[PDB]
Design a protein around this ligand. Structure first.
Ligand SMILES: *[C@@H]1O[C@H](CO)[C@@H](O[C@@H]2O[C@H](CO)[C@@H](O[C@@H]3O[C@H](CO)[C@@H](O)[C@H](O)[C@@H]3O)[C@H](O)[C@H]2NC(C)=O)[C@H](O)[C@H]1NC(C)=O
Ligand SMILES: *[C@@H]1O[C@H](CO)[C@@H](O)[C@H](O)[C@H]1NC(C)=O
Ligand SMILES: *[C@@H]1O[C@H](CO)[C@@H](O)[C@H](O)[C@H]1NC(C)=O
Ligand SMILES: *[C@@H]1O[C@H](CO)[C@@H](O)[C@H](O)[C@H]1NC(C)=O
Ligand SMILES: *[C@H]1O[C@H](CO)[C@@H](O)[C@H](O)[C@@H]1O
Ligand SMILES: *[C@H]1O[C@H](CO)[C@@H](O)[C@H](O)[C@@H]1O
Ligand SMILES: *[C@H]1O[C@H](CO)[C@@H](O)[C@H](O)[C@@H]1O
Ligand SMILES: *[C@H]1O[C@H](CO)[C@@H](O)[C@H](O)[C@@H]1O
Ligand SMILES: *[C@H]1O[C@H](CO)[C@@H](O)[C@H](O)[C@@H]1O
Ligand SMILES: *[C@H]1O[C@H](CO)[C@@H](O)[C@H](O)[C@@H]1O
Ligand SMILES: *[C@H]1O[C@H](CO)[C@@H](O)[C@H](O)[C@@H]1O
Ligand SMILES: *[C@H]1O[C@H](CO)[C@@H](O)[C@H](O)[C@@H]1O
Ligand SMILES: *[C@H]1O[C@H](CO)[C@@H](O)[C@H](O)[C@@H]1O
Ligand SMILES: *[C@H]1O[C@H](CO)[C@@H](O)[C@H](O)[C@@H]1O
Ligand SMILES: *[C@H]1O[C@H](CO)[C@@H](O)[C@H](O)[C@@H]1O
Ligand SMILES: *[C@H]1O[C@H](CO)[C@@H](O)[C@H](O)[C@@H]1O
Ligand SMILES: *[C@H]1O[C@H](CO)[C@@H](O)[C@H](O)[C@@H]1O
Ligand SMILES: *[C@H]1O[C@H](CO)[C@@H](O)[C@H](O)[C@@H]1O
Ligand SMILES: *[C@H]1O[C@H](CO)[C@@H](O)[C@H](O)[C@@H]1O
Ligand SMILES: *[C@H]1O[C@H](CO)[C@@H](O)[C@H](O)[C@@H]1O
Ligand SMILES: *[C@H]1O[C@H](CO)[C@@H](O)[C@H](O)[C@@H]1O
Ligand SMILES: *[C@H]1O[C@H](CO)[C@@H](O)[C@H](O)[C@@H]1O
Ligand SMILES: *[C@H]1O[C@H](CO)[C@@H](O)[C@H](O)[C@@H]1O
Ligand SMILES: *[C@H]1O[C@H](CO)[C@@H](O)[C@H](O)[C@@H]1O
Ligand SMILES: *[C@H]1O[C@H](CO)[C@@H](O)[C@H](O)[C@@H]1O
Ligand SMILES: *[C@H]1O[C@H](CO)[C@@H](O)[C@H](O)[C@@H]1O
Ligand SMILES: *[C@H]1O[C@H](CO)[C@@H](O)[C@H](O)[C@@H]1O
Ligand SMILES: *[C@H]1O[C@H](CO)[C@@H](O)[C@H](O)[C@@H]1O
Ligand SMILES: [Ca+2]
Ligand SMILES: [Ca+2]
Ligand SMILES: [Ca+2]
Ligand SMILES: [Ca+2]
Ligand SMILES: [Ca+2]
Ligand SMILES: [Ca+2]
Ligand SMILES: [Ca+2]
Ligand SMILES: [Ca+2]
Ligand SMILES: [Ca+2]
Ligand SMILES: [Ca+2]
Ligand SMILES: [Ca+2]
Ligand SMILES: [Ca+2]
Ligand SMILES: [Ca+2]
Ligand SMILES: [Ca+2]
Ligand SMILES: [Ca+2]
Ligand SMILES: [Ca+2]
Ligand SMILES: [Ca+2]
Ligand SMILES: [Ca+2]
Ligand SMILES: [Ca+2]
Ligand SMILES: [Ca+2]
Ligand SMILES: [Ca+2]
Lengths: 415, 415, 427, 425
């Protein structure tokens, strides 16, 4: 009972359907049978026709080689044996899988380029080129895939992160085997950037300025300040404070204060234009993070003048009644002769200190001419002897404000 | 020769296989033959057995029944006649056909519910219940199939259309017959919703406010506005204009304009802070569809102040060469004796109107003392006999803005 | 800002199975300057099948609203005009060409079918005319027809998709009465489509077979004096034909007998084929006789077959021996008184000669001595019958000797005839 | 101010196919005053799976980071702490529960497959053991197993997602030797997912068929005087069985002849079935005989079948006629004298009798005359054998006449027996 060959070899694709004849053993009254151990659950050997058949689906990942010992025996007890080595072939029927070994809690904004965000490995149950996989990262992300070792990868940053620009990212790792045809699978991880105090508060205006009218009730709003911080949380919350002033340090509390939460500037007293002209403060915005970032602005407050000071007369000296005595003016001079020079002042400024002398009353109209601005009282015409000796003048000093304030004086001039 | 019956009636499904025996005519050697006209291409009559078989597939849609006249003849002249009537039963072997007679060009979104959009009919080559056709539609789109008279249909609307939500629709009609088993066919049509000016323009900001520095060149851009419109075409093209202002209506053209195509606000004059401080304006954005829709926005323009106005000296009055004479100042004067107080104003605001008084030059340094803030020239010391009788004192008045504008004043002081 | 199209003429090629709702060409009229960007209004110009395609007047793209069909309409030509906010306008032409797809399977239409084919139909006889049609165009409409299986039929192509099913071999109904033939039509599209129709053909029978007798020659042996009108043997003829052409009829056409005798001796039942003897045969009269039988079918014309059967009659022991010489008196006695006393022993007294009309051992004669007054004085030849003297007679013997002889045959049981020889002496 | 959470425990339910990065929950702690609006900073407290969920310290919303899987972890627990700018704090607990989805289909595992099943195997034999596994839980792990086809198998479920492939009919290898069994498993979740595995089964042969002869009765004709050891005919028997149970062995068991003589008359070849003639048959010795043959297969238990074959020996003309009367001397002559010279016409001289041991044409005897001293004087019956006087004797004719008579048969070639008749007047 000779066999055609003493060793048979046959190559089977693992996707080979069940019930297909894989080998025919022909040596006519023979009976064939498995000798020794044979996976009879996978292959069937018809003892009459000598056909080996697959009874079940193959799987290269389960068992990849079989060795069958076939024994042929005739009607007489004649015997022969042969070996059939069935090699099954791998097919790319398994797709790659991604397993995330470690994922960072949060990545700080100031994490340098090259920091490792995530660790992950890949797997493919196939063998050879059907198991070699390529990991492509997807999208517009500041991330790069590094291969630490075979199927042990690293997700890392290669750019500089800025939470105020982009807070989060949707990274999707893709793994594609090099099999024919290829199979691929992907996973998606979300990454959030941790805030760091890398921005300092900045005031809306480089310098601030406000004019407030004098004679104001205290404890009221005079103006407001505001600072921006792109950071978030305690690193993006601003507080306002006064640190420096040209005023006496012990006297600053009496003038101004700042609401550290809102930034409105409170006046804590009734400003006086005549006592203090203006003052300069140094404001500071500041976050409550560690370390604390700050910014200083120069601010100035100019108190506006108001018509609250009546003019007062320096000369002549007034009796408590009001009159002044000048009883030696000579009749010898022609017009243009100055009798006296009235001088007054006003503690205000501008048109509130504009002095205009008016002849309010007189015992003789047209006798004395008074410079509206100079204050010199003169004789406008020649002295006629029909005029009386005793002459009473009543001058009024008025300021250029609206409404004006005035102060009157009596010039008793007799001849 | 006698038959069992004169007339035979059979029922054959149209899907009857070919070569199947239909009738067995028995009457003894006889010869059976077709008499008259008989579809010998469809049925075969064996002369010996008397059987009738189908030579070909049956089809109800072409022939519904056959009548064949068989004849039995003895060896002698004696013969007798028989008639066979074969009836074919209709089987559902035809699927329903959808034909679309008319399909609308465009349906405007303002079309009311129940408007006709498409016309289609259905046909079925079968017969009976195998030709009863039912039309079903997908429910996503707002369309309902209107069951018209007899296998005719209308596709109409059952909701409101909004092309700003969904501009188009895929519509899939599926017709199913009531045969057993049932057959079905489908068709797909695309419906586009037209645009109607049902949305109004929307300004990009709630209200506008821009700062314009004075002494600006005329014909320059100060700020730009934008208005959106989800409509498309002429219904979504915004045109800007100025509708009202707090200024004199005859002067509105002399101050600001707006480019209707771009929405930029042009300044038509050199703004002056000392004349007008700020002015508020109303803008209008409308689409060029008929009828049109519009929206109005508020925009306030603040004129920033610059140091363009020089401080004018009020008191005292100056000569053409800027001279002032205080000739009768007492020589026996106490330190701090108020020689005079200079009054000056500035038409600007803030730093540009913050006046300080300096001493530009003097005949005798240290003879007079001038306050920076109030500009009061006084005597620092008591006048010694070594001091001259006539003294020249050139003072200046400056403001705080950069660059400063100053007004000079030469002073003639005789004792 | 007047519009200009990229091309004056656009061309798009679409497969007919393109889904409804597919953007086919996004027209975008632009300005002559590259830096400037403009928006235009698009609209159909001339006559355009708006039921099939739609043109967005803002985005400018064309989209199909229904499923395309190459067999209904092959191409479209739609003109598009771009208009600005002003009145300036540009124009372009869009030609859409549908591409034929293999979406129709071949259709088989059996134009004419033969009523029936006789087995003697020559090779080249046409049995079926059919045509094939494919609604597709070009190669998706080119067809290949193939038959199915064993049947002796060949497809003969013709002019314009008309086909002929013809016979190539010779038909024999006794071999195969009918065939199931299935025609398959396949287009040379990628992928291809096929459709098949089955027809059934029955071969008609012609009387092409003459009956054959079961045996080349027939020989039957029957004993004589049989019962008349009884079966003696039976013949049978086979005919593979069917119907009237396979109906065998037997008859007697000739023999070596006289005509009237032939009717009285043998007959044959034409349906069964058995042959009957209408009289009791006699071996002494007739020894044997030759006959010729003919089997025929009932078709027109009839086909016959001749076979010669001859009958041999077997002999039985039905005739008793007859004594020819010497002559017998009604008593049964003969008288021979001329016997010489001086004759030597062994002298031939006389010889009894008998014959038998039978044959063989049934005519094989023996002569036995039934009785006698004197035993041992006469000895006869057992077969020759020569009764002569056995021993010389003493003078003391009686002058009158009586002999009683019997002649018998060799049959079972034997038959005999007796004779008395009276012999007296003288001088 | 103090933060207060709306609830001390939050419960959310997430399908396991929830995309990563979706907002699970937005925790918003608030101040107790309805009018007061405040904000707090949130943070994970205690143990928490920071890998699957992320918490924004400002918006206070928990969001998934990776994709969820019910088969791995079914629920998570989070301890969130809300704190204001001061030292006051509040805490709550979020219980996240994942809902199982039908994302895993059931797999078939053929535990054990029978090597081969004999066609006599009882109804209900177990051919295959297999189990079905589904990684899902709940009604997505309950599976219905149905096999396709007409095969005489049905699925008998076992205890715990173990299954048995058993028979429900009788098997017949001569009708169906193999089977393509396709098992389809379908879980009962919505939507359902199904799979299928195919196995092949071969039914073994059992000697259940007995051989049969090609003819019910056998009849054969052979001519006599044949050489010994010659093929006269051949018998053949078929066996639907295959192998040892389908190999026919021929033998002769019965016959009407003498049992000790049967061996010398006829034999049979056991392997081929040819019938050999063991001697030269004689038609005159035996006319016909009956054999009873037996075909048998070589299995346990062996099945047999007997057939009757009748052998008829056909007659050939091998025996010549023999002349009974008259007895002839070595001369081949017989003497009948003392014939009367005055013989009447038709006077019966003698009747010749002869026989032949053959049959039919070979035994049909005819009597002819080859030579004669005087033609026309004696007439011999062609069928009767009667030699008589044809004419009256003339005075010129001699008394001593001789007639050479031969007896012939109708065989091919014909045989004869001769005799010379000496007749004296
Ligand atoms: C009506 O149905 C048709 C077909 O079912 C729709 O056309 C298809 O629309 C989808 C989604 O817009 C397209 O997917 C896209 O494919 C392009 C290919 O370049 C790819 O770049 C995109 O990322 C996306 O995957 C699909 O291609 C398209 N089919 C064809 C043949 O163009 C149509 O949109 C439906 N119309 C309505 C109003 O529902
Ligand atoms: C043709 O097929 C039918 C059905 O398969 C069968 O009944 C018939 O006997 C067949 N005819 C021939 C001649 O084989
Ligand atoms: C089993 O199925 C295969 C594939 O369809 C087929 O080729 C084979 O003939 C089948 N085996 C049996 C015994 O039917
Ligand atoms: C054949 O004969 C033998 C013995 O005579 C007997 O055992 C056997 O059953 C018989 N077989 C048949 C089929 O009659
Ligand atoms: C190989 O040959 C065997 C014969 O037993 C078949 O069963 C099988 O399907 C393949 O054709
Ligand atoms: C990876 O790539 C394959 C083809 O190579 C796709 O089928 C799969 O969906 C994934 O995109
Ligand atoms: C990642 O991307 C693949 C395609 O590359 C998808 O199939 C998968 O679901 C995931 O979105
Ligand atoms: C405080 O509040 C007043 C209004 O009361 C403002 O005018 C001021 O600028 C500051 O914001
Ligand atoms: C100047 O004028 C005012 C106006 O009322 C007086 O009240 C004041 O006393 C002075 O005469
Ligand atoms: C000047 O005149 C006013 C009245 O106008 C007095 O009230 C004042 O005291 C002074 O005499
Ligand atoms: C009926 O009988 C006819 C002829 O007898 C067959 O050809 C046919 O297949 C059916 O069995
Ligand atoms: C239309 O509907 C029928 C059942 O009514 C289906 O069998 C067919 O495939 C189509 O979906
Ligand atoms: C429309 O829908 C039916 C099923 O309803 C399909 O069979 C057809 O091909 C088309 O897609
Ligand atoms: C007009 O143009 C100026 C620049 O000249 C812009 O700054 C302004 O906002 C507007 O767009
Ligand atoms: C007043 O002072 C300014 C300097 O601030 C000079 O530039 C000006 O000419 C005037 O003397
Ligand atoms: C003050 O001085 C300036 C020169 O600096 C003169 O131009 C002016 O008129 C005034 O006398
Ligand atoms: C082709 O592209 C256009 C772009 O507007 C779509 O409207 C159309 O449905 C198809 O996707
Ligand atoms: C003809 O060929 C097609 C494929 O080319 C088959 O699908 C069809 O059943 C027929 O065999
Ligand atoms: C043509 O198609 C029919 C139905 O598909 C088959 O029955 C036939 O055998 C041929 O393939
Ligand atoms: C008529 O019938 C006899 C039996 O009675 C047969 O022996 C004979 O051969 C013929 O068939
Ligand atoms: C001759 O002998 C036979 C017996 O063989 C008798 O039966 C007959 O009567 C005669 O005596
Ligand atoms: C011979 O003997 C028989 C009796 O056996 C007689 O019947 C005959 O007549 C002759 O005498
Ligand atoms: C839920 O809301 C968060 C923000 O609170 C988003 O980041 C997330 O993508 C989901 O929309
Ligand atoms: C199991 O069930 C699924 C769902 O019906 C099918 O898609 C599949 O082919 C198998 O029949
Ligand atoms: C069983 O069914 C599955 C689909 O349900 C197939 O993929 C498989 O090949 C077998 O036919
Ligand atoms: C033995 O051989 C003869 C011829 O050699 C055959 O006729 C006989 O049937 C047997 O096979
Ligand atoms: C009898 O006759 C035959 C011819 O039939 C001879 O061959 C033989 O020798 C004898 O004379
Ligand atoms: C008849 O003739 C033959 C010769 O043919 C002799 O052999 C025989 O003995 C008889 O005389
Ligand atoms: Ca694999
Ligand atoms: Ca793989
Ligand atoms: Ca930051
Ligand atoms: Ca900060
Ligand atoms: Ca004041
Ligand atoms: Ca004042
Ligand atoms: Ca229908
Ligand atoms: Ca129909
Ligand atoms: Ca609209
Ligand atoms: Ca609009
Ligand atoms: Ca100024
Ligand atoms: Ca086509
Ligand atoms: Ca085609
Ligand atoms: Ca015939
Ligand atoms: Ca007799
Ligand atoms: Ca699950
Ligand atoms: Ca499941
Ligand atoms: Ca068996
Ligand atoms: Ca057997
Ligand atoms: Ca013989
Ligand atoms: Ca002979």
């Amino acid at each position: 009972p000779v066999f055609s060959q003493d060793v048979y070899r046959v190559r089977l694709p693992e996707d080979l359907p069940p019930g297909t004849t894989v080998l025919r053993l022909k040596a006519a009254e023979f009976t064939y049978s498995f000798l020794g151990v044979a996976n009879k659950a996978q292959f069937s050997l018809d003892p009459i026709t000598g056909d080996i058949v697959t009874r079940q689906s193959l799987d290269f990942e389960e068992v990849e080689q079989y060795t069958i010992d076939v024994e042929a025996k005739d009607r007489g007890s004649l015997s022969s044996q042969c070996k059939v080595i069935i090699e099954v072939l791998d097919e790319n029927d398994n797709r790659p899988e991604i397993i995330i070994t470690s994922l960072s809690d949060q990545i700080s904004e100031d994490s340098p380029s090259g920091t490792v965000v995530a660790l992950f490995k890949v797997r493919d149950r196939d063998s050879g080129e059907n198991a070699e996989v390529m990991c492509s990262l997807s999208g517009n992300n500041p991330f790069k895939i590094h291969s630490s070792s075979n199927n042990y990868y690293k997700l890392v940053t290669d750019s500089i992160l800025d939470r105020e620009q982009t807070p989060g990212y949707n990274v999707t790792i893709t793994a594609t085997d090099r099999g024919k045809p290829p199979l691929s699978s992907s996973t998606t991880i979300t990454l959030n950037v941790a805030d760091v105090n890398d921005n300092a508060p900045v005031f809306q205006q480089q310098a601030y300025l406000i004019n407030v009218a004098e004679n104001n009730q205290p404890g009221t709003s005079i103006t407001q300040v505001k600072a921006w911080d792109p950071d978030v949380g305690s690193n993006g919350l601003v507080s306002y404070s006064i640190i420096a002033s040209d005023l006496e340090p012990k006297a600053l509390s009496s003038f101004v204060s700042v609401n550290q939460d809102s930034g409105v500037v409170y006046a804590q007293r009734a400003f006086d234009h005549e006592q203090i002209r203006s003052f300069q403060l140094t404001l500071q915005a500041r976050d409550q993070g560690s370390p604390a970032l700050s910014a200083n602005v120069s601010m100035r407050v100019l108190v506006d003048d108001r018509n609250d000071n009546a003019p007062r007369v320096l000369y002549p000296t007034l009796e408590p009644d009001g009159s002044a005595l000048f009883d030696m003016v000579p009749r010898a001079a022609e017009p243009g002769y100055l009798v006296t020079k009235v001088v007054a002042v006003d503690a205000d400024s501008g048109h509130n200190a504009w002095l205009s002398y008016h002849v309010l009353q007189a015992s003789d109209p047209g006798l004395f001419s008074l410079g509206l601005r100079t204050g010199e009282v003169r004789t406008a015409r020649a002295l006629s002897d029909k005029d009386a000796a005793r002459q009473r003048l009543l001058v009024a000093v008025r300021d250029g404000g609206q409404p004006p304030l005035s102060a009157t004086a009596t010039l008793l001039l007799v001849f």
